[PDB]
């Protein structure tokens, strides 16, 4: 009891202070957040200690030790540790980003940022099998306030895990489109296009079919996405003709379009004109036929 | 009271809370020196809400919020004050004024603070804080006692692996707090759902606590003047009902829900049932010594009716799943508990009452023998 009290007092009143915080994390539950908050001060300085080093050293061991402690804590009980640590880490990445390939290379160059993405990766990989939403939401939610300085974590995660990140990104983009960030969505989708065009095309096609206030705006949202990002319309024009080919699909498209006023139908027509004008890579002859 | 609020509005949140605690100390000491029964005025409650729990009284005023670090400073200062407070009456009254429910939006925050403070009391072994928490649990409605028990179980059973040992070391420090914590835990984990099975480490530590000193559960009953009418909506005087519910509903709940861990749970529940039966037999002497034999029943029939209904519902649900052995074990445990309680006078009821109550239960030889 007395030693724990002395540890608490010494912690509350950098390497030694952080080790005191880690011991309290391992021993005294109620102080966790405070230690976590202190750990935030450990990380931010490091990034500065990195950034100034780019402009022109004993805390990297602290970051490594915190990483081992967090990894052990997740491996002991992922269901109880992964959400909290993931949310705290995502808040960390958001704040140090506020305070795509070039930015990715710049930020994975820092040891602290790499460790942050690593603990997020292990937390989600622990929570993919049961319930990754608490992680993904913690990502997606944070992505609201830190765009466009945030996007590259989302890009890295989608590169590592496309099947859920792509769908969630499309859903949140559609939500924003209905409400009103869409530029950030375009940027990340273009970034992951070069390696996951198949999955992006598949998800876009499934959303398009499922649509056939959120469900009415899917087609205009898709057209706006294609007009913003050449990569996606290049990825999808390979099977756009096969997608519009069946008569039932075209009839459903007409029926859905009948619900908008003529000003909106004119805009929908004009969007297709820009796509078929500045989009086709190889299916232009088949499309025009 | 208006002058102090203006001065505290100019200070930082931690210093404001510390000055609030110091002024409460002075005010309650003066009131107890002047009167034997102090009256908790609205002033201290509003002051605690505004400056300790940080509930803004003015809509347009930005609330100064303690960070987790400053809140840990507050917890440390609060624990130090409780340890340094010599007079027990002032300590208990200030604990009540700090943590008595008020029915407002602040209570939740208060709960969190209490749900943390008691946790800190477990870590550094502050006996006065544990005694005050036990008294609060005794004098608080069950809805907040369950919340505090859930918070403590989360900190010491599900979050840190191996920290439960510390809570176990509480047994030799504050037995009253241990009994109240067991009562609140039994009120919390009723085994009605798969998420309400008590934690395995918590179950083991409870079983060890009861087996080491069976009288622990009766400590409150042995140290409280028993009124003619127990208040409705509060924790029971003795958690014997919770232990009966646990022991009888464990087989059905586990069947509804790892083979070795299930065997360990079965052995632990059998040990707990034996300990509870022994407590029931020993209860007769304590009841006779207090001139309460045949007059006060620590186990209520109105509390056994929902238990029997739940047993019948669980048996009906689990019958297609070939759960005959679990149903038989549950019925045997219930019959043993009923027989021992009736023999020791813990349950005040007639045999016709048991005939009416257990008529809907599946046939059991031991249950029929007890009934007849």
Swiss-Prot record, chain A:
It is found in: Nucleus; Cytoplasm; Nucleus membrane. Disulfide bonds: none annotated. Belongs to the Integrator subunit 5 family. Component of the Integrator complex, composed of core subunits INTS1, INTS2, INTS3, INTS4, INTS5, INTS6, INTS7, INTS8, INTS9/RC74, INTS10, INTS11/CPSF3L, INTS12, INTS13, INTS14 and INTS15. The core complex associates with protein phosphatase 2A subunits PPP2CA and PPP2R1A, to form the Integrator-PP2A (INTAC) complex. Component of the integrator complex, a multiprotein complex that terminates RNA polymerase II (Pol II) transcription in the promoter-proximal region of genes. This is Integrator complex subunit 5. It comes from Homo sapiens (Human).
Curated annotation (Swiss-Prot), chain B:
Its main location: nucleus. The keyword Cell membrane does not apply. Transmembrane segments: none annotated. It comes from the Eukaryota. GO terms for biological process: brain development; eye development; mRNA splicing, via spliceosome; RNA polymerase II transcription initiation surveillance. Keywords: Chromosome, Nucleus. It is found in: Nucleus; Chromosome. The keyword Nucleus applies. GO terms for cellular component: chromosome; INTAC complex; integrator complex; nucleus. Component of the integrator complex, a multiprotein complex that terminates RNA polymerase II (Pol II) transcription in the promoter-proximal region of genes. Belongs to the Integrator subunit 15 family. Component of the Integrator complex, composed of core subunits INTS1, INTS2, INTS3, INTS4, INTS5, INTS6, INTS7, INTS8, INTS9/RC74, INTS10, INTS11/CPSF3L, INTS12, INTS13, INTS14 and INTS15. The core complex associates with protein phosphatase 2A subunits PPP2CA and PPP2R1A, to form the Integrator-PP2A (INTAC) complex. INTS15 is part of the tail subcomplex, composed of INTS10, INTS13, INTS14 and INTS15. This is Integrator complex subunit 15. It comes from Homo sapiens (Human).
